[PDB]
Coordinates of C-alpha atoms and ligand atoms in Angstrom, one line a residue:
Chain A
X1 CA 209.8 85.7 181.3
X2 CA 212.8 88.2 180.5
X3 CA 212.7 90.6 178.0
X4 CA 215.3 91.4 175.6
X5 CA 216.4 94.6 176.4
X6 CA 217.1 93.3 180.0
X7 CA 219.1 89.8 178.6
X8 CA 221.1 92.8 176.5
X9 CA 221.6 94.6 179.7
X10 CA 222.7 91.6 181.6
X11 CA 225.3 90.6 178.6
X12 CA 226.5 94.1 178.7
X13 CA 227.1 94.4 182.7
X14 CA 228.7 90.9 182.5
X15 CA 230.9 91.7 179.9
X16 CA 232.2 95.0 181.1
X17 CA 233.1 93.3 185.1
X18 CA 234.8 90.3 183.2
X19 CA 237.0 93.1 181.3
X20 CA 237.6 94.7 184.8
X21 CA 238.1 91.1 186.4
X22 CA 240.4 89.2 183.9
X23 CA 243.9 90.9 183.0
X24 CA 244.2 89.5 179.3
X25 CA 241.6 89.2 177.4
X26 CA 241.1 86.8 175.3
X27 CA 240.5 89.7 172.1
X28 CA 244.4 90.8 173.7
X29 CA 245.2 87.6 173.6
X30 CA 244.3 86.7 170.0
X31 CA 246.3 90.1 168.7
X32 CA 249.8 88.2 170.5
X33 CA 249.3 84.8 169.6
X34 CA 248.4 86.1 165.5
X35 CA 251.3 88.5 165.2
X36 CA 248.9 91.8 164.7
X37 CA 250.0 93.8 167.3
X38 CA 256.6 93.8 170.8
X39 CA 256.8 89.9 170.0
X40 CA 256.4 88.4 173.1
X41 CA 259.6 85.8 174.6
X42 CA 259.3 82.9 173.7
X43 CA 260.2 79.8 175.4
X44 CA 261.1 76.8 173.3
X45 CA 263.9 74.9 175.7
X46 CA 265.9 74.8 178.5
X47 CA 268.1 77.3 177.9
X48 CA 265.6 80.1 176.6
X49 CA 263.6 78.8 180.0
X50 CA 266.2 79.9 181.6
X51 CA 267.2 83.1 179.5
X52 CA 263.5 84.3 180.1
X53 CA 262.9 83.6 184.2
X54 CA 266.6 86.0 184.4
X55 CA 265.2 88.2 181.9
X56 CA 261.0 88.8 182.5
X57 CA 262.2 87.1 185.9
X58 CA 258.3 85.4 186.3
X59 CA 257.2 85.7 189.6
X60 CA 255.6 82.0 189.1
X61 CA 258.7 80.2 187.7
X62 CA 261.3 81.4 189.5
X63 CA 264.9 72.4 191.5
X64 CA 264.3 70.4 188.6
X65 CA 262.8 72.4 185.7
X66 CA 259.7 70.0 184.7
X67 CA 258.6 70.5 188.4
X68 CA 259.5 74.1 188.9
X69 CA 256.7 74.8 185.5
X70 CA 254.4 72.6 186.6
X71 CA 254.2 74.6 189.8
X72 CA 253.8 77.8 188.3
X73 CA 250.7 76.5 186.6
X74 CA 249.6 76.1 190.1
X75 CA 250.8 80.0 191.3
X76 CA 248.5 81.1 188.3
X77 CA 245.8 78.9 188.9
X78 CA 245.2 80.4 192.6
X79 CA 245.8 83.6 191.1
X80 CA 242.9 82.9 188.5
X81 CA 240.7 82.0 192.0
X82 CA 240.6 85.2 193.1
X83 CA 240.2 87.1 189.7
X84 CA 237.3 84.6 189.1
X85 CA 236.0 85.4 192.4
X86 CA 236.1 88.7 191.8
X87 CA 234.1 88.5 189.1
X88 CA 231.3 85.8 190.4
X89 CA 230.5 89.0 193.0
X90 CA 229.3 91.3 189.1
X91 CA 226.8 88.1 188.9
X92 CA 223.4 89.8 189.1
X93 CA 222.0 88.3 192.3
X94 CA 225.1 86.2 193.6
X95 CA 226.2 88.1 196.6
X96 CA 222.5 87.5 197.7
X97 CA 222.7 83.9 198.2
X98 CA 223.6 81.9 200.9
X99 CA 227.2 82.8 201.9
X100 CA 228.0 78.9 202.1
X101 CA 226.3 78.7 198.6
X102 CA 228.7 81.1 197.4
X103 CA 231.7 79.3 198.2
X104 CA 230.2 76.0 197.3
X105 CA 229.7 77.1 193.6
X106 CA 232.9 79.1 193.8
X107 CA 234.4 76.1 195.1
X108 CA 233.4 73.2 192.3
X109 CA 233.1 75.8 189.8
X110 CA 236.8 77.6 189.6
X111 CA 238.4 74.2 187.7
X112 CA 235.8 74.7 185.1
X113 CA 236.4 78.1 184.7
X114 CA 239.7 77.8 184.6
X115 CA 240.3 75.5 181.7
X116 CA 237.8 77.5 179.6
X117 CA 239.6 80.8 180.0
X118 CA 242.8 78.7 179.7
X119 CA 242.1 78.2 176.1
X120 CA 241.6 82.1 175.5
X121 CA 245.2 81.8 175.5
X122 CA 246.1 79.1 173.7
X123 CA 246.9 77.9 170.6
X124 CA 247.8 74.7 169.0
X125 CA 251.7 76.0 169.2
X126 CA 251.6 77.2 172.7
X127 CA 250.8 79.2 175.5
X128 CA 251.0 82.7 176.5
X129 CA 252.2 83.6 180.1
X130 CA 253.0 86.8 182.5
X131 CA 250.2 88.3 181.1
X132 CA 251.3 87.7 177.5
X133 CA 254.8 88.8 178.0
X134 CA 255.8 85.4 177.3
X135 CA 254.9 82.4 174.9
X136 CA 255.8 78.5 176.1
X137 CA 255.6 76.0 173.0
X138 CA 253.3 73.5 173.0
X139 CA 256.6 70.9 172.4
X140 CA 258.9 72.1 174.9
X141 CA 255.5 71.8 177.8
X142 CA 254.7 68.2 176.3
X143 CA 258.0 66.8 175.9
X144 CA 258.7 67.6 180.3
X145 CA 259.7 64.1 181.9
X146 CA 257.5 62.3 184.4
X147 CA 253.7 62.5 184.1
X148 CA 254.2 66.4 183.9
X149 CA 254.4 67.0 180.2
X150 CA 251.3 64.6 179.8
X151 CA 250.1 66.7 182.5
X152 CA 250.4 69.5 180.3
X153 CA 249.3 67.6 176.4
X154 CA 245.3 67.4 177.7
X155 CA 245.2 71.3 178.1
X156 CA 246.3 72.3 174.6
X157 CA 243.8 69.1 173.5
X158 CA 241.0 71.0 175.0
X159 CA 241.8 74.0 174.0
X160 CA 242.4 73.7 170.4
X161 CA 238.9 72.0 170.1
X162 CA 237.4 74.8 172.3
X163 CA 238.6 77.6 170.0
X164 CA 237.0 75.7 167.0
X165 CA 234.0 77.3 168.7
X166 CA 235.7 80.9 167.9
X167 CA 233.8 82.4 171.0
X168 CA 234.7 86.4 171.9
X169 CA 234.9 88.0 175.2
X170 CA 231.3 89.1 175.6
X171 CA 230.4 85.2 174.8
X172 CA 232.3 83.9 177.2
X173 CA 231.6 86.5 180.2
X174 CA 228.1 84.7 180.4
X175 CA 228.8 81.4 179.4
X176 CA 231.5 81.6 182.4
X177 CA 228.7 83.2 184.9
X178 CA 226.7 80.1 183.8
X179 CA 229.3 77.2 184.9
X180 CA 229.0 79.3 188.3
X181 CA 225.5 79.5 188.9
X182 CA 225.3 75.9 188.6
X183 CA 222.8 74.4 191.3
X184 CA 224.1 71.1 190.8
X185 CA 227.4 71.2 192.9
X186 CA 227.4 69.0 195.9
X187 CA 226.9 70.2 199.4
X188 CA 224.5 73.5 198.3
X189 CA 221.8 74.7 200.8
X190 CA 219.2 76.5 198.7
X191 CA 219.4 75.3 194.7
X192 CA 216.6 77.0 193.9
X193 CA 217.7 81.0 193.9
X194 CA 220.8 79.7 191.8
X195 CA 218.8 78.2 188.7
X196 CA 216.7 81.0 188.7
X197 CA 219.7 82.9 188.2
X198 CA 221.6 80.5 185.5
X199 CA 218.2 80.6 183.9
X200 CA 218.5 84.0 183.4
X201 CA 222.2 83.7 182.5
X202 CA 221.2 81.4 179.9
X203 CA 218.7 83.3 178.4
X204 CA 221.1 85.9 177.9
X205 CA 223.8 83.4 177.0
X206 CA 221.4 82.1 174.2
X207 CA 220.0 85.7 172.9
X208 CA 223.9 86.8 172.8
X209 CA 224.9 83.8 171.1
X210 CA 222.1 84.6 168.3
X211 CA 223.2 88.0 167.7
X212 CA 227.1 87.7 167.8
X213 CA 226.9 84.5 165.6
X214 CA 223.8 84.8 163.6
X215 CA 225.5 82.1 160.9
X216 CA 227.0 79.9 163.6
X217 CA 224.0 77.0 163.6
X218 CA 223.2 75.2 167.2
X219 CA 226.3 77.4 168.7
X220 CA 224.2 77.6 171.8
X221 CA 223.4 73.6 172.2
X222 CA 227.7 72.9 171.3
X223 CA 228.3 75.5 173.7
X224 CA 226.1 73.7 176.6
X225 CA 228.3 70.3 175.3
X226 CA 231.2 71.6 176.0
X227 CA 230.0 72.5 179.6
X228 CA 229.6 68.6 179.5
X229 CA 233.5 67.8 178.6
X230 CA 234.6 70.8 181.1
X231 CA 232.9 68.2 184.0
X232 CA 235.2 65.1 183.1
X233 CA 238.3 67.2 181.6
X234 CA 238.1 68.3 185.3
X235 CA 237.6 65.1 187.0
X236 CA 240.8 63.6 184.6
X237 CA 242.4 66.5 185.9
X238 CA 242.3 65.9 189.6
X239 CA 243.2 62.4 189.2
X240 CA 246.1 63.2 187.5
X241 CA 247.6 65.7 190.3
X242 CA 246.8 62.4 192.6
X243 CA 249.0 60.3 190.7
X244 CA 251.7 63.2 190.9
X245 CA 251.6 63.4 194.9
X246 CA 252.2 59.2 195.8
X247 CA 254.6 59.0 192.8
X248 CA 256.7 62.4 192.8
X249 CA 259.0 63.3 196.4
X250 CA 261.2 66.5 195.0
X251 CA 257.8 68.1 194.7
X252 CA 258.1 69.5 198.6
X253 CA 257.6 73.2 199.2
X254 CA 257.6 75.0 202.4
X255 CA 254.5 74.1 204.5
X256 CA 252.8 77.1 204.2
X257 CA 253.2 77.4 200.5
X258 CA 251.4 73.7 200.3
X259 CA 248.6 75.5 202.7
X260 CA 248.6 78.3 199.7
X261 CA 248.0 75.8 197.1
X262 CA 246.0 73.5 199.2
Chain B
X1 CA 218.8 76.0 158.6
X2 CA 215.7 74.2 158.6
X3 CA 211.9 75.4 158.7
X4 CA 209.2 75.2 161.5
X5 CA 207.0 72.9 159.2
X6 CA 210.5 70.5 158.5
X7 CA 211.2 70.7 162.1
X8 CA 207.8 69.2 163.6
X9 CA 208.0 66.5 160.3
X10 CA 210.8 65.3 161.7
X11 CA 209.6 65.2 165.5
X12 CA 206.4 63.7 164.1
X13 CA 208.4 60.9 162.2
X14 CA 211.2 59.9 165.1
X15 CA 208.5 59.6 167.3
X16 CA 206.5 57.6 164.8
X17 CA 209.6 55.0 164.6
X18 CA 210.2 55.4 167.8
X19 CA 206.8 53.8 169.2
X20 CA 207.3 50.6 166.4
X21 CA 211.0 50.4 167.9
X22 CA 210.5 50.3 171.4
X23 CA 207.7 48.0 172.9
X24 CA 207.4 49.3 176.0
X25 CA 207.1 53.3 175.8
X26 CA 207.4 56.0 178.7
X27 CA 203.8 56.7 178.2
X28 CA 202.6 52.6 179.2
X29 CA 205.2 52.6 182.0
X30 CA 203.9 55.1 183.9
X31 CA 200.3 54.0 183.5
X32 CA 201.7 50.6 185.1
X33 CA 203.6 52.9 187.8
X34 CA 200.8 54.7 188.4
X35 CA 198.1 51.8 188.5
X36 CA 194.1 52.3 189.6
X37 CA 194.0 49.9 187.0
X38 CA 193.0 45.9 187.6
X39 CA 194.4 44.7 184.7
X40 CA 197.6 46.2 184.5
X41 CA 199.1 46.0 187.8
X42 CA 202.8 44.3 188.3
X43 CA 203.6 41.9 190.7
X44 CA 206.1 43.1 193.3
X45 CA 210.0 40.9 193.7
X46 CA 211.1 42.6 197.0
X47 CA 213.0 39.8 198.6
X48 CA 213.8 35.9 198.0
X49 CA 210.9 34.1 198.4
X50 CA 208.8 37.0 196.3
X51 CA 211.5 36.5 193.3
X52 CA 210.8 32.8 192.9
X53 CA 207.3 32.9 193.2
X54 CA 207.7 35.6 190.5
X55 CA 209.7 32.7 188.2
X56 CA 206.0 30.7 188.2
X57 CA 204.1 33.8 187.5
X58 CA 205.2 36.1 185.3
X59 CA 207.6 33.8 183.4
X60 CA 220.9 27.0 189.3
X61 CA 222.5 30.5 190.2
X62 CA 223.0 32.4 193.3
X63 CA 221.0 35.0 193.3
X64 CA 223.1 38.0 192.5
X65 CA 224.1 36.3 189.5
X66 CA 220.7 35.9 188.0
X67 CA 219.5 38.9 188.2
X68 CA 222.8 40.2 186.5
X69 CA 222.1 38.1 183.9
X70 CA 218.7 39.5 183.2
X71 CA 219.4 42.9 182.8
X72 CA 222.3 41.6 180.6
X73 CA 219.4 39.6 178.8
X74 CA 217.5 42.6 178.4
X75 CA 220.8 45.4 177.7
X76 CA 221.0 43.2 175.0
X77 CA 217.4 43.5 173.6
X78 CA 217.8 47.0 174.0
X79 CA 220.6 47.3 171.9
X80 CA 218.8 45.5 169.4
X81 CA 216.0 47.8 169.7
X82 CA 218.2 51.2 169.5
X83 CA 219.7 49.8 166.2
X84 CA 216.5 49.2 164.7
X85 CA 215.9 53.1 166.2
X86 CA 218.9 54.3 164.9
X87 CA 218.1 53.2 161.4
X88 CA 215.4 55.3 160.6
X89 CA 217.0 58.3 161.8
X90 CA 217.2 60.4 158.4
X91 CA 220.8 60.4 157.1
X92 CA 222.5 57.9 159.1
X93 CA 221.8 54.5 157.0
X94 CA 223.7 56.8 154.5
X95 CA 227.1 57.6 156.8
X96 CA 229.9 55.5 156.3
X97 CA 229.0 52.6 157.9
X98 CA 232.1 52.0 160.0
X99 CA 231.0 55.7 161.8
X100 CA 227.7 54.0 161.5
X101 CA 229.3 50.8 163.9
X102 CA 231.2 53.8 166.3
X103 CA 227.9 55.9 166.6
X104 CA 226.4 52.7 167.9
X105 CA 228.9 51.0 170.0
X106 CA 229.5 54.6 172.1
X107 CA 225.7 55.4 172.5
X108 CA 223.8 52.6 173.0
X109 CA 224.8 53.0 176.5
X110 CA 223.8 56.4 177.3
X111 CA 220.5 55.5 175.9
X112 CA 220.0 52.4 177.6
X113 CA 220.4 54.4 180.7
X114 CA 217.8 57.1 179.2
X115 CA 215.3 54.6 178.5
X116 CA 215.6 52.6 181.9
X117 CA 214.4 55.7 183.9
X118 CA 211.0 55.8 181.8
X119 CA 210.7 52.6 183.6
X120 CA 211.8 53.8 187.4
X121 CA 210.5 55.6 189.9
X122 CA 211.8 56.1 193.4
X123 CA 210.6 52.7 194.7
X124 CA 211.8 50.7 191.8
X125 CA 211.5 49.2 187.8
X126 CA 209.3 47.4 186.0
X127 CA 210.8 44.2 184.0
X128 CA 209.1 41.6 182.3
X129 CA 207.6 44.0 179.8
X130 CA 205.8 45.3 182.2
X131 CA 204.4 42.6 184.5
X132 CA 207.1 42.8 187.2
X133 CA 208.1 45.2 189.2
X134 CA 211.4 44.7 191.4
X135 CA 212.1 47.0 194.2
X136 CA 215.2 49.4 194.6
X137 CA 215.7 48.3 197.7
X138 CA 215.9 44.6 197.0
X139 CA 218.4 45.2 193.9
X140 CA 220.9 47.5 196.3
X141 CA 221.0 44.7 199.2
X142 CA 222.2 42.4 196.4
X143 CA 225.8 41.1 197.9
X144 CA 229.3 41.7 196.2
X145 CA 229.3 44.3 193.8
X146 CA 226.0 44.0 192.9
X147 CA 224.3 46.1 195.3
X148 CA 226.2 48.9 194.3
X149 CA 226.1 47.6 190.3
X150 CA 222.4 48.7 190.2
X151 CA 221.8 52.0 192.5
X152 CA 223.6 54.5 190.8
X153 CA 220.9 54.1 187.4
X154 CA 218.2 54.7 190.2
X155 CA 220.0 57.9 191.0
X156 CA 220.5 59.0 187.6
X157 CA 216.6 58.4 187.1
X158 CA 214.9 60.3 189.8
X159 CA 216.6 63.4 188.5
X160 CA 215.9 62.8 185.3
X161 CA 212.4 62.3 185.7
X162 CA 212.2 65.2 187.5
X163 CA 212.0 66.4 183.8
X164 CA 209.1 65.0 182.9
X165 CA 209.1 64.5 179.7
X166 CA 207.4 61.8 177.2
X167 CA 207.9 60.0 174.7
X168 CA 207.7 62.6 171.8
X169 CA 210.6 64.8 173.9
X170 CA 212.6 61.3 174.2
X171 CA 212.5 60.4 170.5
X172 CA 214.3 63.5 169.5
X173 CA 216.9 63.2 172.5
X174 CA 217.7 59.9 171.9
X175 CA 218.8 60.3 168.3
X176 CA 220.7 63.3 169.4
X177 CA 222.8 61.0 171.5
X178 CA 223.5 58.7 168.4
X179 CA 224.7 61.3 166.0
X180 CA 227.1 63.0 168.6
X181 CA 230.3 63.9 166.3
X182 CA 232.3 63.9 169.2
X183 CA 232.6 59.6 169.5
X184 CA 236.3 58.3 169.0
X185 CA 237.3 57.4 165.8
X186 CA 234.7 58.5 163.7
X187 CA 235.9 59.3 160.3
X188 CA 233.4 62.2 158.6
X189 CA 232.6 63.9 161.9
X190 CA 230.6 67.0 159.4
X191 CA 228.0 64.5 158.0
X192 CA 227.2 63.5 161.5
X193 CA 226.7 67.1 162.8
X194 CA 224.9 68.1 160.4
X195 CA 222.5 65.5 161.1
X196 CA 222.5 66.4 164.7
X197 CA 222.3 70.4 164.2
X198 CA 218.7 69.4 162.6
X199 CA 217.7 66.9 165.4
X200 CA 218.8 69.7 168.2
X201 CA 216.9 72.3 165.7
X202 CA 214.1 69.8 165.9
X203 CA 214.5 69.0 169.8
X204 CA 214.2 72.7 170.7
X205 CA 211.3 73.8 169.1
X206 CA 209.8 70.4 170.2
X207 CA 210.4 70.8 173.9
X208 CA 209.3 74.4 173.3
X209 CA 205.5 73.9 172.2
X210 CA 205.3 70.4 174.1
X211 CA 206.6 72.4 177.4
X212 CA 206.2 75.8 177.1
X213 CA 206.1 76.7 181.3
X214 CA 209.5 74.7 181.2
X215 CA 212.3 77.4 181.3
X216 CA 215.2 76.4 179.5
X217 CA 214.2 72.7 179.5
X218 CA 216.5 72.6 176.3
X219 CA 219.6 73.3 178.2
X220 CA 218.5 71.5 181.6
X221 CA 218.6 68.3 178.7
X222 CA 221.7 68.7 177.0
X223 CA 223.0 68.9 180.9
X224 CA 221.5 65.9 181.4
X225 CA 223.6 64.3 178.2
X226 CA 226.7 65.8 180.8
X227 CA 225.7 63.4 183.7
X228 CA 224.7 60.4 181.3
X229 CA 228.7 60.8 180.1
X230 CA 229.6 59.9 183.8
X231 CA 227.1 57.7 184.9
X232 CA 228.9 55.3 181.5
X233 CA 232.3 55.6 182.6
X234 CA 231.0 54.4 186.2
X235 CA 229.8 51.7 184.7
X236 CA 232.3 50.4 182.9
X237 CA 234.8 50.7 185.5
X238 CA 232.7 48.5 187.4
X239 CA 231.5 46.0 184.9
X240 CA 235.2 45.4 184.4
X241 CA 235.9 44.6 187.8
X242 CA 232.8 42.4 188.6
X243 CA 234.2 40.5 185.1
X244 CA 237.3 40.2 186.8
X245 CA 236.1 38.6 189.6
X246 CA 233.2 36.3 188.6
X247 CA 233.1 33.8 186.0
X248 CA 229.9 32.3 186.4
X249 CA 229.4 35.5 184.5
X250 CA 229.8 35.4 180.6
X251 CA 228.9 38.3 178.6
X252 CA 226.7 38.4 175.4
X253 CA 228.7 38.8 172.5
X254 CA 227.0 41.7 171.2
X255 CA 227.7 43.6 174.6
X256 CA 231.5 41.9 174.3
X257 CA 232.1 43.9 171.7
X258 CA 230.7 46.8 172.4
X259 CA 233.0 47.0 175.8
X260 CA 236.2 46.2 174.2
X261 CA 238.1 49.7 174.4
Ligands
LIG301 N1 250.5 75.1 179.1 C1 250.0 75.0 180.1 C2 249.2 74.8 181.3 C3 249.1 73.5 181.8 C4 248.3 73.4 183.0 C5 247.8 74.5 183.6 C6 247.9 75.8 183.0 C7 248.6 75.9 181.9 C8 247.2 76.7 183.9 C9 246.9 78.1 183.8 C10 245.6 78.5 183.9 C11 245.2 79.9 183.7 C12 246.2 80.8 183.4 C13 245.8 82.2 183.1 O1 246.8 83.0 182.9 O2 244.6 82.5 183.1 C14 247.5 80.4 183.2 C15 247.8 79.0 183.4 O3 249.1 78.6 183.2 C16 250.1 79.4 182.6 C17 251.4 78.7 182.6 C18 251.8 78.0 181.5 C19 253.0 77.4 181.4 C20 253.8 77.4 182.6 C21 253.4 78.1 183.7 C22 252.2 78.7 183.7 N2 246.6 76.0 184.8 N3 246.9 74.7 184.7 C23 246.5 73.7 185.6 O4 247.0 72.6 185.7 C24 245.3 74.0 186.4 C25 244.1 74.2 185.7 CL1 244.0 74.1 184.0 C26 242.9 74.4 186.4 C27 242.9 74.4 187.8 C28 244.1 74.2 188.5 C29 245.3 74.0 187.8 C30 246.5 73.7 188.6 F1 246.5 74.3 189.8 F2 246.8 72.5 188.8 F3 247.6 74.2 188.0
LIG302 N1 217.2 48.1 188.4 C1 218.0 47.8 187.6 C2 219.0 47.6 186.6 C3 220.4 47.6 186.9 C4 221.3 47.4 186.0 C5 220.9 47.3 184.6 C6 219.6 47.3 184.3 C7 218.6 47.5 185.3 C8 219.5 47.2 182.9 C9 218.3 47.3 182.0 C10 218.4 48.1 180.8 C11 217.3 48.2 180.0 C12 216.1 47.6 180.3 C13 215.0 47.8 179.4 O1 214.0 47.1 179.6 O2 215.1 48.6 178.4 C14 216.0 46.8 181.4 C15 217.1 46.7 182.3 O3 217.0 45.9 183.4 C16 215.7 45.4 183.7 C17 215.9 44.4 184.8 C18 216.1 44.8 186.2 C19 216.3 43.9 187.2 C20 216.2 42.5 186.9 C21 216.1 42.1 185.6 C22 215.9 43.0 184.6 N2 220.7 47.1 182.4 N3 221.6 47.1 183.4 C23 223.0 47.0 183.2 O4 223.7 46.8 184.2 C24 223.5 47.2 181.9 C25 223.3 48.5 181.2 CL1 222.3 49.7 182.0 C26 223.7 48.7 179.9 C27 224.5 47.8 179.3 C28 224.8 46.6 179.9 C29 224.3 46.3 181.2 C30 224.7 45.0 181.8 F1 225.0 44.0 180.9 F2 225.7 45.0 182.6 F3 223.7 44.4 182.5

């Protein structure tokens, strides 16, 4: 169906947009996070919260302090949206389909994506910020009042469980193009162009997979499975933010920032 | 990891134990579904008076409720059958049996719901072994909850059939659902996916030479195991409430304890 040299050729091109697309890598990432590289600032409590939003001054953190984080997660998250976006245009064949299509599977696809890259930076102590700049514990995120630091708890769950899987950059620049291209999201006109392209993507995705991890048995098939978890992670997820908006009132913003984050 | 020739053994036994487990395969459902045949054609339940004169041919509750209690009746038989299944998957009579109780208890479901679709098509599912067939539309006009109880397998079905795979393919998948290391509080997860690394080793190569014009019909599967995840956790959310409500409703023991947490 394919041949080799063109599921290399796709893994290449994919991997060299998702380094133009995506500010930290996840090999950048890694270096921070290990201690093998200027140690970034790390965030353990209130009072270095408040040492490092006057001193990095983050453009996402800057009343109360569980909701004021909780929101920046959201100012990255839309920010993620349009890197993502970005990047779904490199797909080989996406900016052919149906311009509905392509908002559809950007649409349903971005939570996905989102928690996968998440883990990139991530470890089970915390989480890197302002592209790396900063590190948030694990403790200080889970130990917020409310719902919001069992908001945050499920992430790091996922995560540390993802990395297990001890994927790279050029893994993941396919297996993301393959949550996008999926023709199962609701709504989609014309299925068929987009499984002939995450058939291709998976190809590649399975060749790549092969040659990066020649010892790493079935990393293709756990790979697939977590694509399963990503689906109810996500649908947990939503259902949480629910709960937030009946139960929580000081979480107001200024109408046209709720249109932002709509 | 393991060899070609180990690989098809293994597709060659589970589908072996597979055929003495279950007694009514994909393979004879479909012939039923697909009739031209005198002698093995169902009769048809698609309203009231056609489900009692079913009673006195293929052989005090509202109606709803008896139904329910037949696919209850038969949930039951089919956990019965997957654990005679499960046993003869290589390695897992040898687990520690109380991963051996959790492997069980999380997948029968997900394989009950596998193994009702081999018995569905658009129209409807066969019951009675075979010598019934009651129409989707009559099970979704059920009152209550119960209309809504039954449709979502008939979703779930008609996509997964688009598939098409037999019972060979199904073998293999269904003990890849049993040993998933990823069921709460299982104790020596490695064991487990060790056993399932050979089974998805076995799985691929056998939906590669059974299918070969299939692209990617190993991935398009283990995206299947994504929905089947779901389509559970609708379930149960609405097997609770229908126990919360009715009580001339009781629940076989066996699938009492399979539901608790
Ligand atoms: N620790 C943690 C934590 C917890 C919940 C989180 C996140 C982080 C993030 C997130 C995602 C991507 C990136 C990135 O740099 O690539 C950075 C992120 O946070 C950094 C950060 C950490 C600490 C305090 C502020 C910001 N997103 N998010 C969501 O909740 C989320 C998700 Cl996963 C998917 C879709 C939509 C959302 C959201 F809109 F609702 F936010
Ligand atoms: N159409 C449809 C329909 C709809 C809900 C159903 C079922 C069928 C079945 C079921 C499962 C396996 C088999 C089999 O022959 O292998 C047969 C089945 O039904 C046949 C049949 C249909 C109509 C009237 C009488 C019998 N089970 N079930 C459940 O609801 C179910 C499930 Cl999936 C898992 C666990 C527990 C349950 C239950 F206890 F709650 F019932």
């Amino acid at each position: 169906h394919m041949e080799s040299a063109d599921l290399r050729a796709l893994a290449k091109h994919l991997y060299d947009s998702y380094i133009k697309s995506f500010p930290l890598t996840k090999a950048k990432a890694r270096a921070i996070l290990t201690g093998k590289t200027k140690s970034p600032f790390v965030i353990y409590d209130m009072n270095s919260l408040m040492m490092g939003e006057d001193k990095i001054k983050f453009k996402h953190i800057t009343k109360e302090v569980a909701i004021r984080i909780f929101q920046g997660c959201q100012f990255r998250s839309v920010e993620a949206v349009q890197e993502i976006t970005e990047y779904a245009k490199s797909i080989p064949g996406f900016v052919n389909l149906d311009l509905n299509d392509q908002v559809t599977l950007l649409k349903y696809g971005v939570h996905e994506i989102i928690y996968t890259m998440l883990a990139s930076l991530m470890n089970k102590d915390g989480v890197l910020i302002s592209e790396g700049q900063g590190f948030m514990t694990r403790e200080f995120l889970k130990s917020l009042r409310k719902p919001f630091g069992d908001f945050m708890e499920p992430k790091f769950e996922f995560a540390v469980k993802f990395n297990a899987l001890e994927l790279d950059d050029s893994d993941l620049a396919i297996f993301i193009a393959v949550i996008i291209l999926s023709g199962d999201r609701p709504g989609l006109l014309n299925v068929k162009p987009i499984e002939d392209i995450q058939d291709n993507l998976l190809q590649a995705l399975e060749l790549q997979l092969k040659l990066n991890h020649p010892e790493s048995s079935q990393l293709f098939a756990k790979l697939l499975q977590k694509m399963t978890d990503l689906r109810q992670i996500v649908t947990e997820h939503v259902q949480l933010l629910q709960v937030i908006k009946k139960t929580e009132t000081d979480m107001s913003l200024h109408p046209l920032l709720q249109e932002i984050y709509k």
